[PDB]
Design a protein around this ligand. Sequence first.
Ligand code: FES
Length: 141
Amino acid sequence: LASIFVDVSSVEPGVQLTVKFLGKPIFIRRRTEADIELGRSVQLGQLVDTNARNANIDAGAEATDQNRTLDEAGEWLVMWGVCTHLGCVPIGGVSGDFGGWFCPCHGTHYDSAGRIRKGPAPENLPIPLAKFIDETTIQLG
Ligand code: FES
């Protein structure tokens, strides 16, 4: 009964919806074609953290762009908005130097798939249990 159900029917490309779950923000970004291409252009060897940190798939999965989104098309990036350093809320709308998020508390930059690229945070932003249950609704948890 913890699960919640988020209507994403009105989320347009380039919009992040932020929902509170288990007391913390979940970011649901409908990624732009630029965000998607950028994420898919990164090689695993360039990443600080090569683990997908994704509750929905094998815990040893690589942090490819494809392993960071709910959908094959790569439009739906769902992550905990909780910096893996000390838990501040990363600032989005294509912030920081890697086309993603910037955490101002101690200067962590995350890329367009929420992967850590610069700064003190050790890990990619983790991905919650999340799936579409039809065309318009993501179940979290
Ligand atoms: S809490 Fe995000 S960089 Fe320290």
